[PDB]
Each structure stands twice: as structure tokens, then as C-alpha cells.
Amino acid sequence: DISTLPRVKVDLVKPPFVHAHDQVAKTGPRVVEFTMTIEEKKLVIDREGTEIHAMTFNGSVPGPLMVVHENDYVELRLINPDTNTLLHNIDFHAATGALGGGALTQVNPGEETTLRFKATKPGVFVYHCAPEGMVPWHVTSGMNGAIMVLPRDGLKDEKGQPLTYDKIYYVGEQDFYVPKDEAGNYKKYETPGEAYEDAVKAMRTLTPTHIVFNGAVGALTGDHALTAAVGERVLVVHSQANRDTRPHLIGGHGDYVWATGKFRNPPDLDQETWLIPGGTAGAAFYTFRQPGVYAYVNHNLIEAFELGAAGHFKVTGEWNDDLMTSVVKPAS
Amino acid sequence: DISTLPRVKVDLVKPPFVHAHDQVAKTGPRVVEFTMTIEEKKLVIDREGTEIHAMTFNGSVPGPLMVVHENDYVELRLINPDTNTLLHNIDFHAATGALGGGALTQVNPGEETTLRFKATKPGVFVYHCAPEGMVPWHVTSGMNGAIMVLPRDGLKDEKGQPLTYDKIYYVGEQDFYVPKDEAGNYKKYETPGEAYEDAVKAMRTLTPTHIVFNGAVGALTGDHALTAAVGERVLVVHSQANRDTRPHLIGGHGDYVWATGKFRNPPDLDQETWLIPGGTAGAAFYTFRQPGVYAYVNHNLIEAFELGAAGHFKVTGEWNDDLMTSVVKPAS
Amino acid sequence: DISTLPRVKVDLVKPPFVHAHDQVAKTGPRVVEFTMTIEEKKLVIDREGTEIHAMTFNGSVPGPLMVVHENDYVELRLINPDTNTLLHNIDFHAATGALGGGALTQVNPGEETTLRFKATKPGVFVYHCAPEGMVPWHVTSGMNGAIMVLPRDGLKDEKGQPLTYDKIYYVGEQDFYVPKDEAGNYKKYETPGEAYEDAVKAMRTLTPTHIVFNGAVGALTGDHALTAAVGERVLVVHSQANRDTRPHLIGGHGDYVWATGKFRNPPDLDQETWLIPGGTAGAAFYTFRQPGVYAYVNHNLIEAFELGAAGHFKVTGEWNDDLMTSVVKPAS
Numbered sequence: 001d002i003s004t005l006p007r008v009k010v011d012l013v014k015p016p017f018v019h020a021h022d023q024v025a026k027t028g029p030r031v032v033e034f035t036m037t038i039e040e041k042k043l044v045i046d047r048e049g050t051e052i053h054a055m056t057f058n059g060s061v062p063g064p065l066m067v068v069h070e071n072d073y074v075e076l077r078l079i080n081p082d083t084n085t086l087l088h089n090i091d092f093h094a095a096t097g098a099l100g101g102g103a104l105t106q107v108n109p110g111e112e113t114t115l116r117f118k119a120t121k122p123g124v125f126v127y128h129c130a131p132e133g134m135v136p137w138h139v140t141s142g143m144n145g146a147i148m149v150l151p152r153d154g155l156k157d158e159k160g161q162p163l164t165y166d167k168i169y170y171v172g173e174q175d176f177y178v179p180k181d182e183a184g185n186y187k188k189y190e191t192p193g194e195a196y197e198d199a200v201k202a203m204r205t206l207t208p209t210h211i212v213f214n215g216a217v218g219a220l221t222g223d224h225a226l227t228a229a230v231g232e233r234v235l236v237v238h239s240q241a242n243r244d245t246r247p248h249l250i251g252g253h254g255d256y257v258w259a260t261g262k263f264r265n266p267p268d269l270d271q272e273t274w275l276i277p278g279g280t281a282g283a284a285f286y287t288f289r290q291p292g293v294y295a296y297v298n299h300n301l302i303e304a305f306e307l308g309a310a311g312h313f314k315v316t317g318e319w320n321d322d323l324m325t326s327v328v329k330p331a332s
Numbered sequence: 333d334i335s336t337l338p339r340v341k342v343d344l345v346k347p348p349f350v351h352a353h354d355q356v357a358k359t360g361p362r363v364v365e366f367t368m369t370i371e372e373k374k375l376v377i378d379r380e381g382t383e384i385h386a387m388t389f390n391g392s393v394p395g396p397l398m399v400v401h402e403n404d405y406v407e408l409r410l411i412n413p414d415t416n417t418l419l420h421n422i423d424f425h426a427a428t429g430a431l432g433g434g435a436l437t438q439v440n441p442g443e444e445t446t447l448r449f450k451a452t453k454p455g456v457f458v459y460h461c462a463p464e465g466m467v468p469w470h471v472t473s474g475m476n477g478a479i480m481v482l483p484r485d486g487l488k489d490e491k492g493q494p495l496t497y498d499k500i501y502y503v504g505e506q507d508f509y510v511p512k513d514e515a516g517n518y519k520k521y522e523t524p525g526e527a528y529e530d531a532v533k534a535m536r537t538l539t540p541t542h543i544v545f546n547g548a549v550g551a552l553t554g555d556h557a558l559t560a561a562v563g564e565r566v567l568v569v570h571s572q573a574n575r576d577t578r579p580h581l582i583g584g585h586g587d588y589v590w591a592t593g594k595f596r597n598p599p600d601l602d603q604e605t606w607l608i609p610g611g612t613a614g615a616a617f618y619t620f621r622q623p624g625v626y627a628y629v630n631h632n633l634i635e636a637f638e639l640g641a642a643g644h645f646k647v648t649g650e651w652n653d654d655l656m657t658s659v660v661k662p663a664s
Numbered sequence: 665d666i667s668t669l670p671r672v673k674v675d676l677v678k679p680p681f682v683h684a685h686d687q688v689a690k691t692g693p694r695v696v697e698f699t700m701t702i703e704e705k706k707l708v709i710d711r712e713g714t715e716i717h718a719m720t721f722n723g724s725v726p727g728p729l730m731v732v733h734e735n736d737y738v739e740l741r742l743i744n745p746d747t748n749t750l751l752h753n754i755d756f757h758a759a760t761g762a763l764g765g766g767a768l769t770q771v772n773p774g775e776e777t778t779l780r781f782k783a784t785k786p787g788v789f790v791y792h793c794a795p796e797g798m799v800p801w802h803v804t805s806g807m808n809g810a811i812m813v814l815p816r817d818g819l820k821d822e823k824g825q826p827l828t829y830d831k832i833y834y835v836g837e838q839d840f841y842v843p844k845d846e847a848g849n850y851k852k853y854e855t856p857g858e859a860y861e862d863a864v865k866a867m868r869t870l871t872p873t874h875i876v877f878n879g880a881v882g883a884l885t886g887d888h889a890l891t892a893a894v895g896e897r898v899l900v901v902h903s904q905a906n907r908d909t910r911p912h913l914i915g916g917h918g919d920y921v922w923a924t925g926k927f928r929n930p931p932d933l934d935q936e937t938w939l940i941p942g943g944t945a946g947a948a949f950y951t952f953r954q955p956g957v958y959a960y961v962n963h964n965l966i967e968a969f970e971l972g973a974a975g976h977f978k979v980t981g982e983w984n985d986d987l988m989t990s991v992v993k994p995a996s
């Protein structure tokens with residue numbers, strides 16, 4: 001009987017940050033309530049000023065990470081305000097039935113809906129919009145995110161001992177297919193609807209024009225670099241709703257990796273690079289051992305460095321010469 | 333001594349259906365005899381009437397699933413009738429030696445041959461035609477299928493307890509590279525031989541024009557949807573002879589997945605999406621928990637919804653509101 | 665204290681061969697010293713005479729395999745002679761800190777440097793050049809290799825029993841993106857520097873013109889085929905620094921496969937094909953059971969047979985009719 005279960009309202013936060021949660025559950029099963037507002041908006045995705053009509057959950061690409069525990073209920077109030085122009089919906093890969101909730105959540109502009117589902121399987125999972133006949137266009141316009149369903153007793157290593165993270169970041173990687181004119185210049189439209197037939201042609205090339213983390217080339221750099229400290233245990237959740245990716249932390253490793261993101265399986269150890277298939281979320285646990293700048297990339301290095309799929313960590317603390325040292329610095 | 337072993341003749345069936353077999357073996361090792369006839373035929377692959385000269389085992393794309401047990405012998409009589417125009421052969425990834433049988437099975441039109449091999453490794457495996465100098469053209473013209481070598485005691489979960497399926501389907505996914513004129517229109521040829529140099533150029537783009545399940549856009553829809561009932565345990569074998577795929581059951585999961593298809597390994601659990609590398613067969617076990625329509629797709633959603641890699645399940649039975657429910661239906 | 669550790673100088677060998685080493689360590693931890701000289705040179709990559717300005721470690725594509733044990737120190741003297749034109753460096757995915765050594769190893773022409781790092785994680789790992797702002801261009805010009813860090817007690821199977829290989833080969837697979845004129849002909853440049861803006865445009869297509877093993881179409885064929893004997897246990901290390909590959913031994917299997925190359929994980933068994941993600945090295949162990957010719961390919965068969973990603977094994981010994989036999993040879 002759901003009516004006797006505690007309810008908790010959670011306020012979501014912008015990626016790459018994640019809302020406050022407990023790793024090990026301090027309550028029984030709950031109904032966890034979330035609200036998301038669909039926003040269609042113009043987004044500048046690169047240094048050159050290229051603009052798309054993005055379709056977002058809660059104003060961001062990716063949409064925010066939701067965090068619950070195994071056998072909680074998720075109750076999502078989904079709002080499509082009448083300033084939007086398109087019909088949207090939501091499919092949770094975490095959910096069982098009705099196309100992941102897609103069949104039940106169709107909202108025209110000016111409508112809302114509330115969906116509930118039981119989170120029966122532990123793991124990180126993609127959610128994405130999937131309206132009838134326009135699925136890839138919505139998804140590749142930025143309308144995806146992830147949800148993490150933690151085991152009730154938190155994460156475990158390959159031997160079953162606890163793994164506790166100190167920080168958690170969510171990296172959503174996005175393939176965009178911006179239409180081009182005859183010569184190769186990116187096209188512009190006043191509305192999302194205008195772009196549709198050009199979008200389909202661009203998608204069919206199977207060749208994205210931009211691949212980005214957190215909505216833009218260079219979004220996770222500078223002032224917006226991910227931070228940590230030597231000694232900290234960091235969990236990086238990474239999703240790709242449509243295309244394969246192969247993450248790599250330059251100067252580090254994936255100590256414990258769930259490449260396909262499902263925590264009932266033992267993690268892979270000591271990964272240099274791991275494959276997250278399109279339509280999946282993965283998670284990698286790392287303990288920092290050296291300070292400095294790290295690049296976190298898709299290790300198709302063309303995708304990383306030409307198309308945008310690169311971000312930075314800045315790590316503070318003490319250098320360990322035993323691990324690495326310059327014996328003779330560059331010289332004649 | 334093979335001459336003392338029982339022989340059983342098996343009649344193959346058209347995909348997505350699979351011939352009758354026993355999961356747990358009720359006999360000792362057998363010589364299992366199959367016959368396949370090569371058919372070169374015109375196939376319409378999409379809604380627009382695009383026609384290719386397909387190369388098939390037994391008239392279908394994919395070729396039929398063959399089912400044996402570990403340490404049976406497979407004896408295949410392969411017939412290339414003189415109504416065909418090309419030389420064909422067969423390579424079984426299940427087999428050891430002579431290029432998977434490829435070196436021993438070269439049949440011009442009007443020839444036949446009989447190959448025997450011992451099925452020493454349990455798993456689902458691709459078979460495909462591979463004639464000297466024309467390998468990718470035959471394979472990407474539809475000349476591939478799979479074989480399942482069950483363990484003698486059937487399938488097991490990650491703990492080693494029995495897993496028994498109630499139904500089994502075979503989904504062959506096919507990348508086609510149909511040649512285009514200057515403007516983008518698909519070309520037509522009277523014979524397979526005519527298309528050859530145009531086929532090579534199209535292949536070299538590495539960009540397929542169509543990606544389909546069971547030979548055509550929409551082949552596993554409507555009257556041809558896969559069916560099941562709530563409570564049934566379904567095994568879906570999925571092969572891709574040439575290109576990576578990432579299957580996903582929309583509204584469900586892969587409860588137990590052998591993504592690279594080899595049953596001596598423990599399955600991955602609770603998968604949302606899994607990667608089957610080109611040149612591989614995989615298998616996913618699911619128990620249906622909700623009725624309704626499910627889409628089974630390659631979760632590169634451009635590949636799925638624009639290029640054709642989508643099919644349907646129709647599942648009968650009782651809705652479970654505990655798993656999912658609409659709290660407030662779409663409204664103002 | 666490093667100064668009390670034995671030092672051993674190792675002379676590297678050209679791929680696909682690997683320098684002499686011990687599988688099980690016969691000493692305590694050592695500082696293992698290597699020297700590599702960067703060579704920029706013209707390379708002919710295909711049968712048609714297509715020429716690139718390759719960037720190599722030690723004159724080869726790939727660079728040579730380095731072999732150490734877990735908790736050795738690697739000390740690399742890296743020389744960039746003044747006959748080169750570009751700045752290079754080295755990133756080891758085996759190493760922890762400073763972008764894998766990349767930040768510490770920047771050498772202009774006429775400079776050298778010596779880097780030391782502790783090999784803390786067992787596995788096969790990629791190394792590649794990665795200069796600031798020119799990373800994909802150097803890597804896809806051939807500037808990558810691998811290092812193997814063996815466990816101190818050698819390799820183990822999925823049950824933890826020893827696995828001993830009799831021979832070891834290193835296959836580096838390389839994606840090249842040679843620029844084309846308007847009509848599709850490959851362009852030529854007098855220097856590496858000339859090609860730069862054309863290289864970037866070619867890379868951005870994400871479509872390689874050639875995919876090769878060991879630097880050229882047909883490099884591991886004929887006189888240069890890999891050899892073995894029936895009964896021998898062979899380890900094939902395979903790396904791809906930038907793009908996914910899916911190796912397959914035609915007529916054989918991967919008995920024990922570490923697809924993502926990290927030996928603390930149990931191997932996958934009985935693989936037909938396995939996925940090595942771009943930015944990764946993998947390793948596959950096979951025992952030959954039949955003589956004859958085997959093809960070792962990327963099983964995107966367009967990549968294999970049209971673009972160059974195919975090599976040969978020639979295996980000597982006794983044919984086993986029990987495994988495979990032609991019952992009725994091709995005939996009317």
C-alpha cells in the first residue's frame with residue numbers, strides 16, 4: 001500500500017552536479033517526487049557561435065541526474081509549458097512497461113502529467129524523450145539524461161566490500177547533427193519546427209557535427225572544470241542516449257568500472273578506456289593519486305579534440321615522485 | 333567412431349522462428365544433418381520499393397538459426413543450384429579449421445558439398461558466406477545467419493542454476509549499402525554481377541543506407557510482431573555479421589545477457605542496452621512483467637527509426653500498477 | 665629507494681615481434697630502461713603507392729611493444745632528433761599523473777628527455793604521442809604503440825590456474841585519414857606540416873581511408889605472415905589508439921580474451937569476436953588445433969577486406985578430421 005509510504009520531494013540540480021542523497025539507505029522504501037519542466041531554447045554549442053534549437057529537460061543538456069534507491073517509487077511530475085511548440089514525453093530505461101513510461105506521458109504544450117514507477121533494478125540508466133515518429137530528433141536535440149538507482153546498501157567492489165564515493169559527477173555526452181548548406185556552413189532556423197526535414201537528412205549521414213559534454217564545446221573547462229583532491233574517491237556517471245562512447249581519464253584510470261552501468265554485476269578493474277554503448281549509462285570509480293590537470297575524453301580523439309568531447313579535472317594536493325617523475329627534463 | 337552415432341535430420345524454419353529442439357539434451361552426441369539451398373533473389377527492403385539483389389541461405393535474410401548441442405557433429409549439405417550466378421561458400425564461426433569451413437565449401441552454380449564439423453564450444457555464433465575476394469559484398473547482401481550450440485545441460489544463470497526459456501526468437505540485423513546516383517537516388521541492376529563496382533564504392537563509405545531486422549524495414553511489425561505473454565521467459569538471439577549493434581527492449585530489459593554470446597561465461601544482469609560487436613551473435617533472456625506493445629531496437633536511434641532497425645513485441649496479459657502507473661493523465 | 669634497485673636495459677624489436685621477457689618474474693622489482701627515437705618518415709600504405717608522412721616511435725607503425733612486470737619502474741629515454749620537424753611527447757595509459765607523462769615529455773627537434781613511472785596496474789595499455797592542440801593528428805599519423813605490464817606471477821585463467829603462452833605477437837591497428845581532392849584522389853605533400861589543415865578536414869569526416877595492421881595493407885601476409893604450430897599457445901596483443909575494432913581469427917577463436925586488456929579481471933572464454941574500444945589494448949590467447957592458413961581480421965569486413973585490416977597466420981602440423989572434414993567435396 002503506497003499511501004502509507006513516506007514521500008520525499010527532491011529538488012534537482014544542474015549537471016555536472018548531482019542532488020544530495022545517501023549512498024546507503026537510511027529509510028525504508030519511499031515515493032521520491034521529482035518535477036521537471038520541459039524547456040525548448042536556443043543554445044550556442046561551440047566557439048564559432050553555432051546555434052541550435054535544443055529540447056531540454058529542466059533547461060540543461062543533459063537533463064539532471066535523478067538519484068533513488070532500489071525499490072523506491074519514482075513519481076515524476078512532467079510539465080510542458082505553453083511557451084513550447086512541440087509534443088514531448090519521457091521514456092525511462094529504469095522502468096518496466098508502457099515503453100518506459102513513453103506511452104503514458106505524452107504532453108502537448110500547456111499540459112502536464114505525473115508518472116509513477118517502481119525502481120526494481122539497480123544501476124545507472126538513461127531517460128530520454130521519445131515521441132511517436134520524432135524519436136531520434138528529440139534525443140539528438142538534447143532531450144536526455146540519466147537516473148541512478150543505488151542498491152539499498154550502496155556500491156560494492158568485485159569481492160563485495162563497500163565502495164564509498166566522496167564526490168559524484170554526471171557527464172552527459174551529446175551527439176549533435178547540425179544541418180549544413182552545400183559548402184559546409186551550419187544553417188539557422190527561427191523555430192525548432194523549421195529545421196525538421198534538414199535535421200532528418202543530417203542525422204541520416206550518421207556523422208555528427210559536434211560531440212559535447214554538458215551541452216557545449218569547452219563546457220567542463222576553466223572555471224567549470226571538475227574538481228577533486230588527491231585521496232578522494234570520485235564517481236563519474238557518463239551517459240550517451242544515441243551513440244557509442246569510450247571514456248578515458250588522461251593521467252588516470254577507471255579503478256572500478258560498470259561500463260554498461262548495472263550494479264548487480266561485478267565491476268571491471270583497472271580500465272584504461274571502457275565502451276559505453278549508445279542508449280546506456282555507465283559509471284566509473286576513481287581514487288586520485290596525483291595532483292594537476294586531467295583531461296576526461298571520449299578516446300576517439302577526433303571526437304574529443306576536433307568535435308568537442310573533452311573536459312577537465314583540476315586536482316589539488318601533493319605530487320608523488322615514486323609514481324612518476326621527470327629524470328631528465330626536455331633539453332639538447 | 334562417427335558411424336555408430338545416431339543421425340538426425342532437422343528441417344529448418346524461416347526466421348524469426350527457430351526449429352524445434354531440446355534445451356537439455358535427451359540423447360548422447362549425434363550427427364545433426366541440415367540442408368541449405370542458396371537462393372539469389374530480388375528483395376524489396378523498404379517502404380519506397382528499393383530493390384536489391386540479395387544473396388541468401390535458404391531464401392531468407394538472415395539465414396535460418398541452426399540449433400545443436402555441445403559436442404554434436406553438424407553435417408551441412410550446401411546446395412548452389414544452377415539458377416544462381418555466383419560462387420558461394422560458408423564460414424561457421426562455431427567451427428575450428430579451414431577458415432570456418434570456407435576453404436572446403438566453394439560451390440559454383442550447379443554444385444553441392446557436404447561439410448561436417450564438431451561443435452566444441454557452446455554459444456551463439458555467426459555463419460556467413462565468404463568467397464575469396466568478394467567477402468564483404470556477399471555478407472552485406474544478406475548471406476549470413478547464426479548457429480546456437482547449447483550446453484548439454486542447457487543454460488545457466490550467474491550462480492549456475494538452470495535458466496529455461498519458454499520461447500526463442502532469432503533477430504538477424506542487416507546493414508545494406510545500396511548504391512546511389514549523384515543526387516542520392518538508389519540504383520537498380522538486372523543482375524547481382526552488374527552492381528559489383530558500385531557496391532564496393534558504397535561499402536567504402538562505411539555508411540549503410542538501410543539497417544533492418546529480418547530482411548526489410550517493418551518486417552517484425554504488425555501481423556509479423558513477435559508475441560509473448562506476461563510471465564513467459566523469452567530468449568532473443570541477435571546477430572550482426574559485419575557492424576556493431578546495441579539492442580534494447582523498449583519498456584523492458586535484458587535480465588540475463590550474453591552480449592558476445594558465449595555460454596561458458598556468466599551472463600550480465602539487468603542490462604538496459606548491450607553491445608554486440610560486428611561479427612558476433614548475442615543472446616538476451618527476458619521475463620515479461622507487463623502487457624502491451626514493446627519496441628526492440630538498435631539504440632542508435634537514427635539506425636532504429638530512420639534506417640529501419642526496429643521491431644515490435646505484442647505481449648498479452650495483466651497490467652501491474654505497482655510497477656508503473658499514470659497518477660495524473662496528460663491534461664491542462 | 666630506487667637507487668638500490670637493479671637496472672636492466674632492454675633493446676626493443678620491430679612489431680609484430682616482441683622483445684624477450686619472462687612471463688613469471690625471476691627477479692624482484694627493477695628499473696627497466698628503454699630508449700626510443702622518434703622518426704618522421706614517408707610511408708607507402710597500400711598497393712596503389714599512396715604515401716603519407718608518418719610519425720613513428722622507433723621507425724615503425726605501431727611503435728614497439730614494451731614488456732615489464734607489475735611494480736617495476738619504466739624509465740624511457742625519448743629522443744627527438746633534429747632531422748624531425750615537429751614537437752612530440754608521450755602519454756602512457758599505464759602511468760598515473762601528468763597526462764600519462766605527456767606534460768613532462770615535450771621534446772622539440774634536437775631534444776631528449778627521460779621519464780620514469782611505476783607500473784602499478786597489470787594489463788596491456790596504449791601509449792601514444794599527444795602534443796597540445798595536435799593530438800588526433802599525431803596519433804592517426806601512426807604515433808602509438810602499447811606496453812604490457814604482466815602480473816609478477818604471469819597470466820591466469822578464470823579459475824586462477826596458470827596460462828603460459830608459447831609465442832606472442834603484437835598487432836597494432838591503424839586508422840589513417842588521407843586527404844582527397846574533389847574527385848577522390850589521395851593528395852601528396854613534401855612535408856608533414858603542409859598537410860595539416862587538409863588532415864583536420866579528413867579526420868572530421870570520421871571516415872578512415874585505410875585501416876591497416878602493422879603500417880600497411882598486406883603487411884602481415886606472405887613472407888610476413890604470423891606463424892605457429894598445432895599445439896602452440898599463442899598470445900595476440902592488439903591495440904587501437906583511436907577507433908573501435910573487433911578482432912576475429914578466421915577458423916579459430918579467442919580461448920581466453922581480455923578484450924579491454926586488464927589482467928586483474930577474469931578473461932572471457934570462447935569468443936568468436938571481441939570489441940576493443942578505441943584508446944585500448946586487448947589480448948587474446950589461443951591454442952591452435954588445426955594446420956593451414958588463418959586470417960586475423962577486424963570483423964567489420966569492409967574494414968578488413970576493402971580498407972586493409974587483415975593479416976594471416978600460417979600454422980604447421982597435423983589435420984584433425986574429427987574437428988572438421990569435407991564429407992562430399994564440391995561437385996555436380
Ligand SMILES: O=N[O-]
Binds near residue numbers: 053191
Ligand atoms: O527558443 N526555442 O527554440
Ligand SMILES: O=N[O-]
Binds near residue numbers: 081
Ligand atoms: O502546463 N501546465 O499545466
Ligand SMILES: O=N[O-]
Binds near residue numbers: 243245278632
Ligand atoms: O552508435 N554509434 O556508435
Ligand SMILES: O=N[O-]
Binds near residue numbers: 243244
Ligand atoms: O561510435 N561512436 O563513437
Ligand SMILES: O=N[O-]
Binds near residue numbers: 257263265267601603
Ligand atoms: O552492467 N554493467 O555492469
Ligand SMILES: O=N[O-]
Binds near residue numbers: 374386
Ligand atoms: O534475382 N536474382 O538476383
Ligand SMILES: O=N[O-]
Binds near residue numbers: 413441443
Ligand atoms: O546443385 N546440385 O547438385
Ligand SMILES: O=N[O-]
Binds near residue numbers: 575963
Ligand atoms: O563495425 N561497425 O560498428
Ligand SMILES: O=N[O-]
Binds near residue numbers: 575576577632635
Ligand atoms: O556502429 N554500428 O552501429
Ligand SMILES: O=N[O-]
Binds near residue numbers: 594597932
Ligand atoms: O561471450 N559472452 O558471454
Ligand SMILES: O=N[O-]
Binds near residue numbers: 704705706717
Ligand atoms: O620524411 N618525413 O616525413
Ligand SMILES: O=N[O-]
Binds near residue numbers: 331332745773774775
Ligand atoms: O636529440 N638529442 O639530444
Ligand SMILES: O=N[O-]
Binds near residue numbers: 300906909942
Ligand atoms: O571510435 N570509433 O569506433
Ligand SMILES: O=N[O-]
Binds near residue numbers: 907909964
Ligand atoms: O567503429 N570502428 O570500426
Ligand SMILES: O=N[O-]
Binds near residue numbers: 921923927931
Ligand atoms: O579489462 N579487461 O580484462
Ligand SMILES: [Cu+2]
Binds near residue numbers: 087089131
Ligand atoms: Cu521531446
